[PDB]
Every structure is written in structure tokens, then in C-alpha cells.
């Protein structure tokens, strides 16, 4: 109730510039857990048209083509495209009621007057209230328009739910003081709607006293527009998986390039009397099993995520500028100030062929050990994890850069790169660009300090 | 009198100040005056006003609703606080009247 | 006289509970004195009490 | 008590002397209610003898150079004249300190009773006369709390059960009298009260008793020391000839009820709450603290609730519904 | 923080000391406030400044 | 405390009799100094053509107030009052006081002279806002109905009070401090009216109560009965200019309570009062 | 009977009369002439006369000593009235409202109260949320508890004086001024124990992260919301960091005991409140030095209680056990002949 | 009553009681007006917490009562709580410049910039940190800048707010420099932002149709420096019909109570007014309570 | 009375035969509403046992 | 309370006890003996 009415009047206020009509929503335990609902910081949502580009960027074309350029200094396009991607999303209103409830009961406890066609007893574990405004460009509206949701926790994580507007306005347009009249008129119907992937459903409300009911828009759903909107959604999903395709063809290229005699780049004791025909055969059987279990939550996606940040590109240029310099002169070392890569955070794909349980996202802190130390892979706690002793594993290592290691058991490795040049840029950002922190309640003003406890508007306590 | 008395405190502090408050409820179409004597341990007026805002939100939304429903009528106030003095924890005796009450008559500090 | 609770004092409820405990114990224990105890030491202690 | 206290430092042989030179070794004070016990209990060691107490206070004057060094260096060296003479003279041992040459040359007798404990003579002194008709309580009526503790509802084992009291009591053989659920105590007066489980309900249903969030938060800080294809892939699980490692909850059941508390047990560091099963498990090849709840009381381990305990519990439940002879 | 030279160089007064326990045990368990235990002979008590 | 003022000039005995008639009145003082000349006495050091009223009210805030105790032939005993204890004042203002009136201090508008009015608080407040709106009207006085509004705005009705408050605009020119005061009021009104629309959105992304809803409803009623992506530094300049030009209006929005009065002498020529200041 | 077995703890404040003995000239007192200051009122004139005393100690060690000699009454009821947990944590409500209301109706507490914020908990020193009872015939009361396992072997843990945690956490046992050693002694479990040769005795009460260490330790209580005014008996046993701070040489912990570790309870109220800078009465707490507790007479059945009452003197010191019933006898007879001698 | 006593736990050496006699007629915040307090509730260190907020310190410092320090005697320090309207001497320690006839109020100690950190009474685990005694223009500027910096920082990424804060956190007054350490978003801060938004929008409703367009009429007529400076931002934003003067009187009265409620959010109560200052600016006499 | 009442602790010690306390001396002085609340209302437990 | 048994055996036991046998309180299955809190049947009658 608290955000629905306010954002309804706010979209009535801001309707002139961007014709956004409100969608009053509530979520449940199917969308997210209770712990995730207690600390949800803020919500982002994006209007993207049937052509599939955006509502923030330019109408015709963009400076977001020229697919990847495979660079380190710009490394996507620089931060201007990051500013663009920040300008795509909007920060909609947000309210959590973390307590079990019946929804129609709760609107009866408020001033809202409920009447549905038939009594649907809805009972969920908590409530979070959210309104979304989909932007009709003209007065008319396209059925193959699609939406995006982003749920942000203060750690920096995000979850993306995407769906078409066709299922949102399917039955509704076919049938079709201000705060006092809004309660008296109230709701007309309640409707649940799944996403495009059928992984989560969520309920929408429909008030009759909304200003949506008097705008008299027109609604059409042409099939060739639906045909291209899934094609634009095809490339949006495909940005994660054809990158995994780009890793696998790189392995088959360099192994044909080398000829099958691959070197060692990792510190392992070995044993000569142990057979190696058994080890080579378990390379092929397990390598396909990694492709069978590929996911967005993987090491190679986590390798890219610090690179698509705000201060990543200028710091990456600062890295090579510190390397590519002269040796310190004899006049420098006596009177210049003291001049500054000990260990790096690597991400790892651990596959195991004995039980077919593959671990995708693994933090690894690795460093050069002394006395011609090739590489040694420790945990966050110096555990020296020791999976690569066993015959049952194969492991893939990535760097914060695009350097890439496929390591056989016994620590024998294949050193290659990561090629993303086949991937375009605007789909590379919107899947996993590292978004910046925006200040809210309980946040320090200056950039980073000893942060206090979380807000945690929860149901275990009273609100106060 | 016991009906005009209230607090949000278990009434055990030493320097229990008193504060005469009055509200103006506009839930009816006429003005509804609610007079309350408010004792409190907290002495500073600003944080007491934040407490009164946190406690009396219904009168605030009724006041702004009276403003948006009758723009020809001018609103008088929303709430007025005036100090009278202070007492002790033992100075109360349940009609609850005060034995030793040092008076400090200040001024009508209003709030909206 | 066991606890100093003279005529100028107020009384907490714990104080009155201790007073009642001593009331019941000494009305039970030493109600009829000379019919029970015929030893001179306890009677002397009672009289100096 | 008298021979455990060491003697003092200030040599004062003249003051507080009795007749015939029997010096005073100490002083005992208490309330009058203890003195009426001691003096009536110790009738062969009490005399009303008079002691020659000092009559005046020990007026100690300040030297002028003491005042000069007091203004200058913020300190006083007492009897600066004797220090100054004996330093430059040569002898390094003074006759007396600054406090023994003050507090004498006045003697007045007073009749206060003494006691005699093996060449030690202690002045006994009741301190009622300073505190009668006085608003302040006695400091000698010091308050001391003790911490009592007792169990309720326990379970002695049956393989070591016994009765050391056979001739004294005899209980009828009902189940309600052969399994404890209550506990009887004593009040101020000797009246048998009763605690049971029902009276503890102002504690036992609080939400903080069921909230393991700081428990999990401190357990993780220590750290460690597809159903669709399943019906066909059941034999696919057994083609591999490897064994599965024994989990932690199964490792809580091979311990007897008397050695589960011993140090030979390993899994006690995962036994943290009666309502949950805190355990380490494997997720993303990393040991994580998996805070899972128990749902029924049967999930409690064997050493913490044995089988025969549940048999006796269901015997009590069968007794409660009038079914102790079963059909 | 304490002038330990002045404890040595000043003319002392003589008493028979009677500790309850052994004196080094009371020192090592720091019953007193300020301590200056050492061993052997120390020339620290000479540099008068 | 004690304040001694003197006169280097020569004082006539008729002027001595005139001065002792002002036995206990208020005289403003620029600094609490034990000896002082009589050129610091009163308000004659601040009178000119151009300052008018708002400079005088803004200047009497940071000055202190005394009361005359006795008059000698060459020095006047000025006694600074203290908080809490009660005193005796004289009514030099044309207003006559009643019991319980909170008294305010105000400069009088209607080669050296001694001149301040002691008005009760509501009359002072209403003539303050009357002079304010009379300065708001002061630029467009060529019309007739606003001239009738000004003529109605001159005279105030009170118990034995038919006052003619003077015209703040003179020779179609407003004095510059009243110009800044009315400009500050117009700009705080405008800046409020266009920044609350942005900041009610920039605040209700947090926990929103119903007061925010009714606030936005009131604002949309305003915006429809009348007729966002801002640069950061221009926004900072907007907010800071709002608050700093608000800050020079504290002299006009409040009322310094000075005296709380008690029982009054007959003919209302003097009154016993407490100095609550 | 449910599937655990709580043990209770309680504190019983006694009124004793302690006799004191000191050697001759054990202390020199220095006094001065009285000093007069003049405070003024309207009709009265309060004169504050001040006389200063400096009491210089004389002897080397403890030249003066005392002993707790003669009790005459108790102040607490020595009862079984359990601690109101719904006022030491007034914020924690259940997630569903209706099952919370059903629990409040099943229990004795009526409604949840809002906790005070920082400014008002500064300007008012505590809460005192519990209401003083109408008729108090027995005195004040306290009874907290620890959820234990019902296989707690009582024969070596409940008949003798013991620490109710499970691990003997007396701080004299460790080497003084060692931080890792005391934490290894009172938290770890891959090592033996003092006073019992098993690892623990109550595994839901010994280590960190039990319900005890989040229920009675003031650090994890401070991480959540609690009431600082209500006194708990477990606060002397489960405040771990105060005991680790108390690891000194033993003469210094004697000085800390007799000077700074004096607990205080307010005595004019019906419940057990913590004072606000208690200068009225400092209750000497001897159990804090030892970190144990005393066993009190508890009887499973009324028949064994009756055969305990029927016997003469010395019967309370014995400990008879039936088949499943058992009598734990007190280590010191303060129920046999305290109220007998009154 | 007024004379309260504070005892200590540690012993007193000569330097500590010397630093105490250096604090004669100082100022220390006390809670609850207790007749006897320990030295742990003395001063401000029981409530100080870095990375907790400057606003909560500025709140709860104002709620503790104030006293002066005099008459040390040994293992106790006497505090005399001042009464209303009486003339006391105050020794400042916060190095801000004082002038006569000037009002004073109390702010929590914002660190000076070199991080002098002058505890000026040494113990093991506790320091006597002193409240600042700051004149009313500087303190009102601190309050206004804290409110503005709180309002601008909503819905902003770190870079633009950092670029505005590194200028906005600095402030000068009679050749000095100050920063603000813990400016975080707090619940008291957000409820004051809510109060400011409601009151300022109520000003926006209660404007007449001539006082909204007065500045446009002056920009039509005259062209002055402050006119152009106001009109510049005003243009970046972008004959009277009926004159019933009593309605303008009522509109201005409502606008006056709303501007008082807006101004009260930054302007505190004056708690000290000076009388005369020593030229070395280490002590001055003041006539008010605490 | 009822034939199921608590024999083992109500009849062997000295108790009031009605069942509640009614001592009028653990209850506060001159407070009649607290008196009838302590003597009659069964929502408030007995103070004696 | 005053000594009231419910059967005659429990009465006859307390008329054969040694000293203070009235002051005890012993219970059978359903039969019981309420005790005696003050020896009124061995003080007034024994002095005769």
C-alpha cells in the first residue's frame, strides 16, 4: 500500500516526459529467500523494446559495436559505456513487509476495498512491494516489449529476472483527495505471472482508480515482432555460453598447435612408474562433462566481473605503465621515494570424473613459490587445497586478466589466453557488468571505511 | 488526572521532566482537541519533538489531509508543547498528583 | 530488634516478607516456653533477649 | 585466627598496656548478637580488666624546610631534620620513624573486656552503641550471596540402576513414579515446594531459545579443525566402485551413553544446540557451516538420549492415556 | 616512576619484618604496588643527577 | 553588573529634570563595558536615510539591553538586568500593556538625541509582517486597488492605538535591506516550490511513510493548479543558497521574548516585570 | 517429559554478621580539624562541615582478617520462580503474529514492549520493566536455567560443588597473564578438563556457540537486544571475557575479589535488579573467585523428601538414590540448622 | 543537588592532579544529574565510537547535562552543575576564536586536522575527551553543512559525492580549518530529512501568487550582483488580480510557523553567552546554564 | 473443599485454611485495590506457596 | 495443623514412639497422618 499509491502519483507526475505506466507488484518466497528479503537494498528495473536495445541509449545505433577488441587498457570500451549502462536502469520504489500474512486480509486491514471474481486464498511467508513503469514510446504499446528486474543486496550481488510484457498485459487489456478515492475504488483483480524462463512467478495488482485506465493506449502483438524479440533475447542469453564455446575451441587449437607434448606450469610431485595412458583418457571424458554443466556462475565469468568495473580500466593502464619503465637510475634510488604482485585471486573450475560432481566457482589465492617455483594454489586460509594430487580431478584456472590455464592431474598445464572477440559488447555489459554502490541508509559518505551493521528491516524484532 | 497522563517510558528515572502537550485532531470535520500531560526523563526539546513525531503520526497525516481537503481554511497549528518543570521518581502517587513539583514555566513551543 | 526497623522507617516488600518470616518462625518456635524447655541456659538467654 | 595475623611495624610498647605488663596483641569486633554467643560460650576466658589507652591525639607538626620542599617539589619527606643530620653524620639507621614520636605522654584507664588465647590477648568489642537509633546500617552486617544449582528431570541409566534405600520407602510400580519429571526443594521455612517443567514456561518458549544466528555466526568463525533421471540412474550410481565417506550425524551414534562426553569423541565440536544439527559439509569444494534444524526429538543422538529413554518416555505417554495395560 | 636510588641512599629505620608468606613469593605474585627486585649488586644507586 | 555613562558636554538643569523623568527605561548598548561615553547610548549612532527598519531589527539582536537605575547630574547609573529576578520598567511606547503580556523590543519609526519602543509580542509580530507585505507590494504601486490595500495596511486596530506606520518605499525606491529581506522570502518560496518535487523522489527511495504520499499529492495539486536530472554542483548551489538566504531571516521569523509582565501601575505608565532574556 | 533436562541456577543473598580481627597498630589514622563551608538558602543556612581522614596502612601483608560467622536470615525466597525471559529480551517476537499471540496466552507475559533507544537508555540508567508484585511474603526471587542433556551423569557433577558450564573454568588454575592458555582451557575440546577427566559434561553449555553462550554472555547479548537492568545468576559464569581479563597473579585476584568484584543487587524491589553505581550495599560474592556453585537439596519424589525430613541431624548431607529417583544432598548444612537457630 | 562528586579507580600522581587543576572551569557532559558518578561515565569516551556517526554523537551529547570542574581534593573531583542565568567562568580547550557579546553552544569534538588527539588526562583504557565550545555562527554552519551533505548524498554514486564532499567538508572561521569525520546516514538524520521535506513542501503550498513572482519583478526592474546571482540559478530552474490582505496575512503567518519549524532543524538552543574574553583566548566569563 | 487438594504441602505446615495468603502484611499499606487484587483475583498467583 | 490420622494403625504407631513421635508426618498408600508443628500432646499433657 505504501509504495503503490505514491509511485502511482509519481508516475502521473513524470508521465509527460517518459510515458511509463505503473505495474504494482508483490513478491514471495518463490522469488527469493527470507534472508535475501530481509536485507534487500534496492531494486533496479529496465525497459527494453521489441528491437531489444534499451530505453537509455541512442535511438539509431550506438558506440557499443566493434565487438570486443580484446584489449586490457579499454577492456570493454572504457568507462563511457559503463556510464551508459548505469543510465539504462532506473531505481524504482521499494518496501518490505517481512512477516507472514494473507494479502487480501492485509488490504482489508488497510483502507483498500478488495473484490475479485472468485476468492483466491493467497498465503505467503512475507511481502515485498515494488512498482515498475514500462515505457510506451508513443501512446501505443508493443506486446513483445520485455522487462528486467535486478535485486541488489549490500554485498554487491545481483539477480536478474526477465520477462515479456505480453504476459503482463494479456488478459488485462483484452478485458479493458486522491488518496481517499484510491482506497474506495481499490483493486479489481489479482494475477500471477511467470517469467520468460518459468523459473519464478509473481503477482501483480490492478487498481481501477489508476491513471492507466484513462490513457486509452492501443495494444498489438505482431508475430514477427515476437519472432525478433526472442532473437534479441537469444543473444542476451548466449553471451554466457558461447564464451564457454570460445574456451573449448581454444584448447583444441593449442593442443593441435603444440602436438600433444604439453608442459608443466604447476608444482606437483609426480611418479614415473604410474601409467599415463589412463590419465590422458580421463582428460577427454571429463572435458565434455564441464560443457554439460556450464553455467553463468562459473570461474571465467567471475574473471571478467572485476574488469567491467568503474576504476578497472585506468588501473589496468597504471599496471603496464609501472612495468614498462626504465630501471631506477643511480640518482633516483638515493633521493627518490620508496618504490613499490605478491599473490593474486584466481578463480577455478574443478571437475571430477569419479562422481560427476563439478564445482564451478572457487576462490584460489595463488603465488610464485621460491626456487624456480612454477605456481602453487592455496585457499583463502593457506590450506593448499590439494585437489590436483588426485587422479579423479581435472582443473581449469583463470586469472583476473584473460590468461587461462587448463591443468591436468599431476599439475601439467596448458597455457593459453581467453578470446572474446566473437562476442559483441552491449550484451557483454548488461549480463555481468560490475555495478557501483549507491548510497542508502546506514552507508558511510566517504568511499569505504569501517562499515556498520546492516539495516535488516526484519520480522524477528519490531520495526521501530 | 489519570486520563490526561501518558508516557513512553517505565517512569523510573531521576529527573522526570514534565511537558504539557496539546494536539489538534482533524479526523472529524470539526477540530478535535486532545490535551495530554506528558512526563519524560528526556529533557532536550528537539529529540522530544522527534519522539512526538514518531508517536503521533496519525495527527500529522490528519493535519495535512485537512490542508489538502480544505484549502480555503487556514490550519491553526498541529501540536504545541510547553514545559512546566520536573519531578522525581518517588514524587508520583497514584489521580496521580505530584508532591514536590518545582515549576519552570517556559513558552509555547509548537511543532507540525 | 533483630533487624533495625524502628518507627521512622519505610518498608520495601522484601523487608516486610523477612519480617513475616521471622513472625511465623518465632510464633511457632517459642510460643509456650517453659512447658517445653527446662534447661537454665536457654531460659537465661531468653531473659537477656 | 589470632595466630595467622602478622604483627605490625610501629613499635609501640607503652600504649595499650594492661596491668602487670600483659600487652594487647589485637582487637576483635563484631555485632552484639555474635558477642552474646561468644561471651556466653566462653565463660572461662573473659575478664573485665582495664587498659591504659592514650588520652590525646598524636599531634604531628610540619617542619619549615618540609614546607619549602613541599612548595618546590610537590613532596614531603617526614622528619627532614633527622634525615639531614643522620645522612651527613654517617650513621645509616635512624632511631625512630616520624609516627612513633607522636601519640604518647597521656595515659587514661578504661574498662573494656579482654580475652586470652595462648599468650595472645585480644580486646573484645561489641559495636552496638554507635548504631542504635541510627539511620545507617552496620558495615559488619555484610551481605553475601551464594549460588545454588540443581538438576530437574534427569535420567539415570538402567544397566547401572539400583536402590540404596529399600527398607525406607516403597513406591507403587506406576510409570509416573519410576521416571522423574519434577523436583522438590525447600523454602525459607521448611515447606516442600515443587518445580516442574510447566513453571519454566516463562523461559522455555522464548524466541531466543530457538534462534541460532549468533550460534552459527560464531561457529563459522572457528571454521573446520535432477530427480527426473534418478529413477534410471540409480544403478548408474553403483557402477563406480568407490565408497561414500561416513557423515557426521552417523558418527554421533557409535558412542555409548557414558563415554560420549569423553575427549576420545571427535564430533563434540559439532554438538552445539539441542534444537539444531550444526555440521560442516562440502559446497563448492569448501567446508561450510550448514546450520540445519532437528524437527523431531528422535533426531537427538544416542549418547544424549538413549533408546531405553525413549522406551520409558512412551511408557509414560501410554500411562497418561490410561492404557498401561495394553490390549 | 619511583625514585629507587633514594630508597637505598637515605638513612633507613630498622624493623623486624614478619611477612605472612615467603618474601620472593609475594614479590613474584606482585602483592605490593611497586617493586624493584633485582639480583647481585647494582650500580644503579650511584649516578646522582 | 553596573554600567556608567557620562557626558563630556554640559547638561542643563531643565534637561536634568527631563532625564530623571526617564528614570527606568531601556537603553540599548553596543558592548557591556564598565565605563562608556554617551555617543554609544541609545540608537542615534545608527540613524540615517538608508537603513530604515530591517537593519535596525537585525542590529538590536546582537546588542545588549540595560535599564536606567538612577540619574546623577553628570553620570547615569545603568543597571544590566539578569535572568529570573523581576524589575520595574516604564512604558515609553504608545501601546499600553495588560497583565501577562510577553514584551518585545523594537526600534521606533513613527547634535545628538536619545531615542526604543516596548511593544507586546503579538502587536510586534503583526506589524512586522505588515511592514513585510507592505514592502512586497512596494514595486507596483501605480495601481489603485493595491493602493487601497496599502491604505488599509497602514492603520492597525488595538486598544487606544490608531497608528500610521510609515511608507517603506520612498521616491519609488525601497531601501536595500528590506529589498534583500523580501528577495530572500521570494527566493526561499521559489526554491522550495521547485526543489520539493525532486527531493520527495530523492528521499522516498528509502522507507516511505504516508506523509510522503500526501506530500506528493499536495505537490501535484500545486503543480497542476500552477501550470530533474540536474548537474551536481548546480544542485549543491541551489540547496546551499536556499539555506544561507534562509539563515538571514531568523531575525524576522522568531520573536525574542524579553519581559514577562506582572501587575501594572495605574494609568499604565510603569509596570513590574520579570526579565526573561 | 520432553527430550532434555534443564538444570537451574539461582543466587540467594544472605545477611551475615562477620567478626573482624586485626593486630595492634595495624593502621595509623591521620585526621584533621573539621572544615566549615557555608551554603545559603532562603530561610535556612546549610553548613557543610568536612573532616578529612587519611588511613595509612602499616604492615607488610594482610595484618587483618575476618571470617563469615553468623547468619540470621535470608533475603531471597529460595524458591523456584523462574526468570522472566520475556523481559530480558523484550524485542524478540515470533515471526508469525498469531502463533506469537498464542504463545503469550499460553505463557504469563501479556504483550511485547519496545526497547528504549540510545539517548533514553543513557538518560534513564535501566528499564525495570517487570512490575513489583502485590503480596510479597517470602522476599525477592531469581531462577535462570541451562538446557542440558538428560544423560548428564549427576553422581560426579551434581552431588559435589561444580561449575554449571561443564568445564571447570576457575581462573587461578591457568598460568597468570596468559591469554591463549585460558581460552584453550575453557573453550577447546581436544584436551582434558579440570575437576573432571572427561572433555565436557554439558555439550550444549560448554563451548562457544551454544545456547548458553548466546543466552547469558553479555557480548552476544549485546550483539542482539537485551535489558541491562535485570540481574542473571549466569552472568558470573558465562561472561567469558571478564574472566579472561581476571587472569592475574593470585594476590592481585584477591585484591580484585575484595575490592572490585563486589557484585550488587537492589534490595528494595520485589525482583533482582542491578544497581546504578551501587554505593548503598556491596554484596560480597565469593563464588566469582572460584567459578563454581553449591549443590542444594533437590528431591525427585515426595517420599524421599519425607524420609529426609523424618531423620535427625546430618541427614541432609547424605545422598540417597532410588531406581530412577534420587536425592542430591547439600554439601554444607544450611537447611538443617540455619532456620533452627533462626 | 548541584554539587556532584566523581571518584576515580586509578591512583593520583602529581601530574594527573596537575592536569586536573589545569581544567578548572572546564566543561564536561554528565548524564542523568547523578549525585555520585564514576569516572567511566565522565567526559565523553563512554559514548565515543569512530565509524558510528557524527550525528548520533551530536544528538546524545546535547541530552547529557553540563557542568563545570573545580575544587579537586584527592580521589574525587567536584562538579558544580550551573543554574540558569548565573555568571560563570568557562575555560575552553577547542581552539576556536572567541569574541565578546557572542553566543556559544556545544558540538562533539570534530578532529582538528593534524589529529592532535590531545587526551590531556592519561590513563590505560580511558581518556577524558572534552566537548568543544563553539560560537553560534560556526556551529550553525556545521549543522547546515551536515544537513546539506546528508541531503545531497542520497541516490548518488561515490565519485560525484566525493568530489563535492572534499570541498564541502572543509570550513574556515577566523583563520582555521575543520573537517567532519563520521558524517554517515543515520536514522535520526533520515527522520530530520523527512521533517525538512514535509516542512519545506508545506512552505511550497503556503506561498501567495505575488511572493512567488516578486523576484521576477525585481529582475525586470533592477540588475544588481545578488540579483544576478539569485536569478542565474532561478533561470536554471525555469498586474495582480485579487488582493485580500488578511489572506496574505494568514498565508504569511502559516509560512512563518513553517520557516520556524524548518530553521529549528539546524539551529540549536544557545547554551552560553560570553561577557568578556581574555586576549589569550583560554578563558572567558559566560552567563547561562549548561 | 475438594477431595483432590494438595495434601502433602498444604496441610502439614501452618497455612490459611481458605487457601490464599490473606496476611494483610505483605501487601502495601493503605492500598485497598492492591489488597483485593492480592486476596481475590485468581489471575494473580498466591504469594504463600 | 493437629495430629489426625485416618486409620487406627498409624495412630497406634505414634502412641508407641519414643520421643516427639507426634511431630513426624508419615504416609501410607491412601491413608495418611497430618503432622504436628508444635508438641502440644507431649508438653501440656506430659507435665500433667
Residue numbers in the entry:
A (entry chain M): 1 to 176, 301 to 464, 468 to 591
B (entry chain g): 168 to 261, 273 to 290
C (entry chain B): 197 to 245
D (entry chain a): 246 to 470, 487 to 588
E (entry chain B): 1 to 49
F (entry chain I): 6 to 115, 129 to 133, 135 to 246, 257 to 306
G (entry chain a): 1029 to 1370
H (entry chain h): 5 to 242, 255 to 306
List sentences quoted exactly from the publication behind this structure.
Here we present high-resolution structures of the A- and B-capsids and in-situ portals of human cytomegalovirus. The portal proteins are believed to orchestrate nucleation of the procapsid through the formation of a portal–scaffold complex, which facilitates procapsid assembly. During the maturation process, the disassociated scaffold proteins are expelled as the viral DNA is pumped into the capsid through the portal located at a unique vertex of the icosahedral capsid. All three capsids possess a mature icosahedral shell and are distinguishable by the inner capsid material: (1) C-capsids are filled with viral DNA; (2) A-capsids appear empty and are assumed to be products of aborted viral genome packaging; and (3) B-capsids have a featureless inner core consisting of scaffold proteins, likely generated by an unsuccessful initiation of DNA packaging.
The CVSC heteropentamer in the mature virion of HCMV consists of one pUL93, two pUL77 (the upper one and the lower one), and two pUL48 (the left one and the right one) molecules. The four-helix bundle extending to the vertex center is formed by pUL77 and pUL48, and is associated with the “base” protein, pUL93, via the N-terminal region of the lower pUL77 molecule. However, neither the peri-portal nor the peri-penton CVSC of the A- or B-capsid comprises this featured four-helix bundle. Based on the C1 reconstruction of the CVSC-binding penton vertex, we next built the atomic model for the B-capsid CVSC. We found that the B-capsid CVSC contains one pUL93 and two pUL77 molecules, but no pUL48 molecules. pUL93 in the B-capsid CVSC is essentially identical to that of the mature virion, whereas the two pUL77 proteins are only resolved in regions associated with pUL93, spanning residues 2–42 for the upper pUL77 protein, and residues 12–63 for the lower pUL77 protein. Given that the nuclear B-capsid lacks the portal cap, which is formed by pUL77, and that the portal cap is essential to secure the packaged DNA in place, pUL48 likely offers a supportive role in portal cap formation, presumably in establishing the featured four-helix bundle with the pUL77 molecules. Overall, our results demonstrate that the formation of CVSCs can be divided into two distinct steps and that the final inclusion of pUL48 would automatically result in the formation of the portal cap, regardless of whether the DNA is packaged.
